[PDB]
A paper describes a structure:
All of these mutations are known as EGFR-activating mutations that induce ligand-independent EGFR activation, and recent studies have revealed in detail their structures and sensitivity to various EGFR inhibitors. However, it has been reported that within a few years, most patients acquire resistance to these drugs, especially 50–70% of the patients acquired T790M resistance mutation in the ATP-binding pocket, known as a gatekeeper mutation. Despite this, ~10–20% of patients develop resistance to osimertinib because of the additional C797S mutation, which occurs at a cysteine residue required for covalent binding of osimertinib, and the resultant EGFR compound mutant (activating mutation/T790M/C797S) showed marked resistance to all EGFR inhibitors. In 2017, we reported that combination therapy with the ALK inhibitor brigatinib and anti-EGFR antibody was effective against the EGFR-activating mutation/T790M/C797S and EGFR-activating mutation/C797S mutants.
In this study, we first determined the binding mode of brigatinib with mutant EGFR using crystal structure analysis. EGFR-T790M/C797S formed an asymmetric dimer composed of the donor and receiver subunits, exhibiting inactive and active conformations, respectively. Brigatinib bound only to the receiver subunit of the EGFR kinase domain, and the brigatinib-bound form of EGFR-T790M/C797S was quite similar to the structural model we previously predicted by molecular dynamics (MD) simulations. Brigatinib formed two hydrogen bonds with the main chain of M793 and was in contact with many hydrophobic residues such as L718, L792, and F723. In contrast, the M790 and S797 residues, which are the main causes of resistance to the existing EGFR-TKIs, were slightly distant from brigatinib. These results indicated that brigatinib preferentially binds to the active conformation of the receiver subunit of the asymmetric EGFR kinase dimer. Crystal structure analysis of brigatinib complexed with EGFR-T790M/C797S mutant kinase showed that the hydrogen bonds between M793 of EGFR and brigatinib play an important role in their binding, and L718, L792, and G796 were in close proximity to EGFR-bound brigatinib. Notably, this binding mode was almost identical to the predicted binding mode as per our previous computational MD simulation. Our crystal structure analysis revealed the binding mode of brigatinib to the EGFR-T790M/C797S mutant, and through ENU mutagenesis screening, brigatinib-resistant compound mutations were identified, such as L718M/V/Q, K754E, and G796N mutations, which were reported as osimertinib-resistant mutations in clinical settings.
Numbering used by the authors:
A (entry chain B): 697 to 862, 866 to 871, 876 to 986, 991 to 1002, 1010 to 1018
B (entry chain A): 697 to 987, 1012 to 1019
The structure:
């Protein structure tokens, strides 16, 4: 092949600080963290994955393979891996963006978010996944909360808990955001990621409304077998919304492939106003509220 | 062009039940039913279509594309669908045309169909098909069996399982293979699998002769294979007895070999709307002097 001239930074546990916990699991747990590196004035937002136990050689094998893949990931729309840290409990530092996640952004800015932006993010999210899918990497948790805002023009999808097919499947919870075949079998393919990519665009178009809200997670299995999907967002034409219906096809192969979505979504992004209808579309970028919590330096800016 | 703000509603199959099979088909089965929107306290009678097997991705893509057209058309003479059900095998929920195909309607009632309705029914098909010509669409299976009767006064068009859309660039569409009823199709479609609206004027043509004879079998004894031969040779369908030569000439100008020689639907609307201003004059039928909610829920 080619040399994987990928770089692996070793940070010291006294450089990063765990602020609060994000997710948790049997083995492993994910925190919100601030990185203060090598005596600079800058503080960079990050998320840190910690093996819950420090002596488990099968678990320690796993957490390094993931470090391996996250460090091999070099794409503008998948988060970089800032560095690992060899405590007893091995830690991974993925970067975060200073402005926060899309969902919190889209919710806070829906009276000045435009049509060219919404369609421009669908290509960035789809570009990022087809990068991942290009690598036999399944993502298993795509959602607006896991798409971070670098600049209202650039978004990356966080890549913790990726699943390489080292083949037609790999097993492994976010019920609203999952394919039926995931709820009933806890199996994740790339086409189940397409389902997630579906629900992700829905959260975007609705300006951050909650998928299947109030409804219990035990029903979603059933109210999917029976054919209820998310409704049409108001601003969606029937061209946009057919993409979303196709992502939630019960048949997995009937679902759009990721290479297709970007073709389809940039074509619709060259005439943006023809596919999305937003009141006042014609007549602004700024800071967020996740960003207000921190007061604040992008990690892509420091390491340059 | 214009943003297509046509929405499609998604319905879970708990919101409708099927009461009666209206017909088995190669498409599959279509049922008669009541659809009670959850939330709403109306029942709306509906017709529910359900293909044989959702095994192929091609089968799914051709049912969701059939649903894309039906959902975005707002024409009075184009049967519209209410919503879709994304079950394992998807499901289509359309307004129930209570009276059947026109093909069924005019055999049962050959004894009580005056000239006014038959020419009114031809102005209505032509208006729906000129809506479809305006949306760059080719229906590709028009026939009295695919024209449904919501009321004797008002007829609508249906079954876009074979409908195909044109780009702005190409003026004609060409499929391969397929299974299409040979007796309703223009000669170029039989012979080159070419299609275009001018091939659908020919279909419209056969649809009238269907109506004008009160629902006969076109080329009845003739099997499908010979029709290419017989058309090339200049055989066409005979004159309906009810028909004047003014009216039967129009069906002739449809089965014209040259597709642009054939008449545009825009013309067909005017030519038949005049004819319905003096209907006794262009059609001759002995006796002719003598003879829950709905799509009211849409607005
Ligand atoms: C209840 O109203 C109907 C009655 C019948 N009848 C007509 C007489 C027929 N006869 C009666 C006498 N009997 C002894 C032998 C049979 C039985 C079926 C058929 C159809 C509708 N309405 C209806 N609405 C919407 C649709 Cl969308 C649809 N579609 C549809 C219905 C049936 C078959 C195919 C279709 P398609 C072309 C694929 O939509 N169909």
């Amino acid at each position: 092949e080619a040399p994987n001239q990928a770089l692996l930074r070793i940070l010291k546990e006294t450089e990063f600080k765990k602020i609060k916990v994000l997710g948790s699991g049997a083995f492993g747990t994910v925190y919100k963290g601030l990185w203060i590196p090598e005596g600079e004035k800058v503080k960079i937002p990050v998320a840190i994955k910690e093996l819950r136990e420090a002596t488990s050689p099968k678990a320690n094998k796993e957490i390094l393979d993931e470090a391996y893949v996250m460090a091999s990931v070099d794409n503008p729309h998948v988060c970089r891996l800032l560095g690992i840290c060899l405590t007893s409990t091995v830690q991974l530092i993925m970067q975060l963006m200073p402005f926060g996640s899309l969902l919190d952004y889209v919710r806070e800015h829906k009276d000045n978010i435009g049509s060219q932006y919404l369609l421009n993010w669908c290509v960035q999210i789809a570009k990022g996944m087809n990068y991942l899918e290009d690598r036999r990497l399944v993502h298993r948790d795509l959602a607006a909360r896991n798409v971070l805002v670098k600049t209202p023009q650039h978004v990356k999808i966080t890549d913790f808990g990726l699943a390489k097919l080292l083949e037609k499947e790999y097993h492994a919870v976010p019920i609203k955001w999952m394919a039926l075949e995931s709820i009933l079998h806890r199996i994740y393919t790339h086409q189940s990621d397409v389902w997630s990519y579906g629900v992700t665009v829905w959260e975007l178009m609705t300006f951050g409304s909650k998928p299947y809200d109030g409804i219990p997670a035990s029903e979603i299995s059933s109210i999917l077998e029976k054919g209820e999907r998310l409704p049409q967002p108001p601003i969606c034409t029937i061209d946009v919304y057919m993409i979303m219906v196709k992502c939630w096809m019960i048949d997995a192969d009937s679902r759009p492939k990721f290479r297709e979505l970007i073709i389809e979504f940039s074509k619709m992004a060259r005439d943006p106003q023809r596919y999305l209808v937003i009141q006042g579309d014609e007549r602004s970028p700024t800071d967020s509220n996740f960003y207000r919590a921190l007061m604040v330096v992008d990690a892509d800016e420091y390491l340059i």
